[PDB]
């Protein structure tokens, strides 16, 4: 059911026991940190400070890797969620101090912070009361410790909407000898944001896209959709016309100017495409395909000037071998 099988469990242990580089900027001593070690000690020092953790989860490219290695979503980002009950203004400070009391062990909080920390964002608004710490790595591999009390709905694809509760596995780590075999394997529960975990995993199996909360479609939603489309995730949706109309509309609303478009495509080509080459040019033509075929409210001159911005960039990719 929701309970992970063995091979999934072994892969989960994989990306969480295999170390990550904490590259050195300013203070140069790099740090080989095993994700399991940080997840444990963070949860521990948090519960020790009487904060009250509900669940520690895993999200995105990683959980979609442990469930089904076949799908294109490659484990290149470790997204860790710490579902908890943080309400006091000081609760976020001691969460900060816990993560920094943890990264000194593996080697003053302010200095370690200014060295290896990429981002520290805390949002206390109408529905979002979450905190985030992104540890830096020169290889672009990104680790995100997200401590989320309450979080608004978001535009979610099926195959990206996966969350696996690491708590049953954490127990096996504090026992001296990790007591893990095919027979003694922690029952780990996988879950989905998009909806029924049975539905969502099936989508992951046979390369289908499907959405929920299209009300919260973001500007760049069209871009990420073609990334699924370029990764063989064909939308079986025959409601794809509306969806494509839905995301194209918001892309040109949020990025009305042509120069503002070029900057977004230049960045998405640069960052969101790593270790990919024909994929870049393929991506540009499938975006072209979606725009020319599906959009339905771009002005005449706007349509051409956008489509021709894609073709120029595809020339740049071709011209670079």
């Amino acid at each position: 059911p929701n309970v992970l099988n063995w091979e999934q469990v072994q892969r989960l242990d994989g990306i969480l026991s295999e170390t990550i580089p904490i590259h050195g900027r300013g203070n140069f001593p790099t740090l080989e940190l095993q994700p399991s070690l940080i997840v444990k000690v963070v949860r521990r020092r948090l519960a020790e400070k009487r904060i009250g953790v509900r669940d520690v989860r895993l999200n995105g490219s990683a959980a979609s890797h442990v469930l089904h290695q076949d799908s294109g979503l490659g484990y290149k980002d470790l997204d860790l969620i710490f579902c908890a009950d943080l309400r006091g203004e000081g609760e976020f400070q001691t969460v900060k101090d816990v993560v920094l009391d943890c990264l000194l062990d593996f080697l003053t909080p302010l200095t370690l912070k200014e060295a290896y920390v990429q981002k520290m964002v805390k949002v206390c608004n109408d529905s979002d009361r979450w905190s985030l710490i992104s540890l830096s790595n020169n290889s672009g591999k990104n680790v995100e410790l997200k401590f989320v009390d309450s979080l608004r709905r978001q535009f979610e694809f099926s195959v990206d909407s996966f969350q696996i509760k690491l708590d049953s596995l954490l127990l096996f780590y504090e026992c001296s000898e990790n007591p893990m075999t095919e027979t003694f394997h922690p029952t780990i529960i996988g879950e989905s944001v998009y909806g029924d975990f049975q539905e969502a995993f099936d989508h992951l199996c046979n390369k289908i896209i499907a959405t929920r909360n299209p009300e919260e479609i973001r500007g760049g939603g069209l871009l990420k959709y073609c990334n699924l489309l370029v990764r063989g995730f064909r939308p079986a949706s025959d409601e794809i016309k509306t969806l494509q109309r839905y995301m194209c509309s918001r892309f040109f609303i949020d990025f009305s100017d042509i120069g503002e478009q070029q900057r977004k495509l230049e960045s998405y080509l640069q960052n969101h495409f790593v270790g990919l080459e024909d994929r870049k040019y393929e991506y540009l033509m499938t975006l072209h395909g979606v725009v020319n075929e599906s959009t339905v409210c771009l002005m005449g001159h706007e349509r051409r000037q956008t489509l021709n911005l894609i073709t120029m960039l595809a020339i740049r990719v071709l011209a670079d071998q």
């Binding site: 920390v117 981002k119 520290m120 608004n125 990104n142 503002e260 977004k264 640069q270």
Partner: protein, 163 residues
């Protein structure tokens, strides 16, 4: 409503680009001469009235969420120009209307008490600060205790530019 942002993985060119972007706003600001008794940025007292208040928080939180992308270190300065220096943007207008660059003797006290509010544990303050010692683009919008009740007023953006 707190929203606090800290980014330290910034390039030296990104520091200079935001410094220049910030100092163009300083040119648009009248200086306080003969009226009174590395960090670069501004501190703006933002009364949370349902109009100008809510619109600004809309824009500030939207940019912060826009900065939570996987890397976005390049698109930072482009987004900052079109954010703090643009038109029909409740924030850029706030930075164009009542902006005052102040001398060191006044500005240091503000950066000091601001730092203490963000670290210790009223008036709503919207700030953006770049510091090099180590780049530290720190911005946010935090409910706190008075930092410059003496000279600052509602929707008045104080400029902190020191060495």
């Amino acid at each position: 409503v707190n929203i606090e942002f800290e980014a330290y993985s910034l390039s030296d060119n990104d520091y200079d680009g935001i410094k220049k972007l910030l100092q163009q706003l300083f040119l648009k600001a009248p200086v306080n001469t003969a009226e009174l008794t590395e960090v670069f940025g501004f501190i703006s007292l933002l009364n949370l009235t349902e109009r100008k208040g809510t619109q600004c928080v809309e824009q500030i939180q939207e940019l912060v969420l826009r900065f939570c992308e996987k890397n976005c270190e390049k698109s930072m300065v482009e987004q900052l120009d079109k954010f703090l220096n643009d038109t029909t943007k409740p924030v850029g207008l706030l930075l164009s209307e009542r902006f005052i660059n102040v001398p060191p003797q006044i500005a240091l006290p503000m950066y000091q008490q601001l730092q203490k509010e963000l670290a210790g544990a009223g008036k709503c303050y919207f700030y953006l600060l770049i510091s090099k010692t180590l780049v530290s683009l720190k911005a946010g919008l935090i409910q706190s205790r008075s930092t410059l009740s003496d000279f600052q007023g509602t929707f008045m953006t104080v400029g902190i530019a020191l060495s």
